[PDB]
Write a protein that binds this ligand. Structure first.
Ligand SMILES: CC(C)(CNC(=O)c1ccc(Oc2ccccc2)cc1)c1ccc2c(N)nc(N)nc2n1
Ligand SMILES: CC(C)(CNC(=O)c1ccc(Oc2ccccc2)cc1)c1ccc2c(N)nc(N)nc2n1
Lengths: 255, 255
């Protein structure tokens, strides 16, 4: 199979909200927690794309390795597969590439590609992919990078992991803009919002085009723009490093 | 339904190991991480019981509230249900109860009870419980605490959450012994181990009696005994507090 890769920096998951009610609930939880509410709190609002999350490493501007999210802590080495994705640059353009930079984002299959692939499948006696999401995951997680080569995949960056030879801007949005400039792809629907009301609008606007843009949008990820606040706000951890459950082999049936 | 309760302190999950290989892997990961290996590292080795995890709160010795684990961050108020569990004390015996103490452990159904309950079910035209685990969960999560009253449940403590009017000992094992003395039930199979080899023995010994003791044992949870090291070792977190995914309502079918 694929070589396993332990992410130097974790690939955390997200809590979900399925209503404005739960969303404000989330906001309030933050306000209280924050030492002093800046008023009115700015969120970097970006669309959540339907696909597979991946981590790409750049060493002095050169794409050197990539992996799948895995369990969030260990993924699979899909470097070669990643190089086949056109919109993924092999070289960051800056003249001053950080020592090491880890770009994170969604790999996905737009409607046109998805539709074409499935047309081919059906007409050639092969189960079609249920959705662009699943199609993406399979197209990408290929032992033979040539197959991945022929699948229409696209990368939309949303974050950074390791980062050394740099002093990243203080705001997430500023960071995404930097990633753009150095040649990395990031969704253009990302906007800045002040206060729930404003965010909720973003939510509505995006939802009213979750499929109209040419690709699938799962929902919207809302993040506090100010990096300092992020550090302050913390991480809703779970599972200790000092312990572990060593489970017994499954119970067998009678007979 | 049940009133929701947000755990003041989280109810973390555990990583698993299904082989000595993965176990040592876990140990090594710790040794490296630790600033200085004390040699040879002591683990509090306790059996992992098959059932439901619960959190019981004592205010000045009095059981005042209890809840289910939920998603680890929010559970259900099952206080009344808990009071029906015999081996759960309503009053900690010490003359000096902490301001507030939160005891955590597994609620479960031993073989005898499980078997009896199911005998009744079958003979009265009712689906039997597949296992003591499931039977426990259902017997406990009852809107009517009287039903829970008639199900044979048992509590085996394994940890502490909130703790105020106290200065808990420096070792987990010391802490469990304290919980015993103040009247709380804890599994007697808990032993102390030095170095993998020793732990691995515990693993074998317990596995060779995972059902022979009169109740079901899932596996064995291994923890570093020294609380200081625990703090040092940290928490393998996942999910930020500064962000959240606001998902769109599910996709609908054609027609
Ligand atoms: C926000 C984050 C959860 C990424 N963030 C991280 O993975 C992450 C990881 C370690 C961090 O810091 C730590 C460093 C060391 C230890 C622990 C935490 C901080 C953020 C996320 C996840 C999924 C997303 C998605 N599908 N679409 C969009 N648009 N954005 C998304 N954003
Ligand atoms: C070790 C722990 C994961 C409990 N520990 C915690 O829930 C926990 C929670 C917050 C902690 O500290 C924090 C406080 C605030 C924020 C974050 C962490 C530390 C431990 C656990 C889980 C399941 C067990 C089981 N089925 N059987 C046995 N025998 N032991 C078990 N032990």
């Amino acid at each position: 199979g694929f070589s396993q890769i332990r992410h130097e920096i974790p690939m955390l998951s997200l809590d979900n909200a399925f209503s404005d009610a739960e969303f404000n609930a989330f906001v309030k939880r933050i306000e209280d927690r924050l030492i002093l509410l800046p008023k009115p709190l700015t969120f970097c609002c970006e669309p959540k794309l339907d696909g597979l999350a991946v981590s790409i490493l750049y060493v002095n501007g050169e794409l050197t390795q990539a992996a799948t999210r895995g369990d969030g802590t260990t993924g699979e080495d899909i470097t070669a597969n990643i190089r086949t994705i056109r919109n993924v640059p092999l070289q960051l353009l800056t003249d001053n590439p950080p020592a090491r930079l880890e770009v994170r984002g969604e790999v996905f299959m737009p409607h046109a590609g998805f539709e074409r692939l499935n047309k081919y499948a059906l007409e050639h006696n092969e189960k079609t992919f249920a959705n662009p999401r699943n199609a993406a995951a399979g197209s990408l997680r290929q032992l033979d990078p040539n197959i991945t080569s022929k699948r229409p995949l696209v990368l939309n960056a949303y974050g950074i992991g390791i980062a050394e030879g740099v002093g990243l801007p203080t705001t997430h949005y500023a960071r995404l803009q930097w990633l753009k400039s150095i040649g990395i792809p990031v969704n253009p629907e990302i906007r800045l919002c002040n206060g729930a009301d404003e965010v909720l609008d973003f939510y509505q606007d995006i939802q009213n085009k979750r499929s109209s843009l040419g690709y699938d949008i799962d929902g919207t990820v809302l993040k506090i723009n100010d990096i300092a606040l992020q550090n302050e706000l913390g991480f809703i951890s779970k599972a200790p490093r000092w312990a572990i459950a060593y489970k017994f082999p499954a119970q067998e049936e009678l007979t």
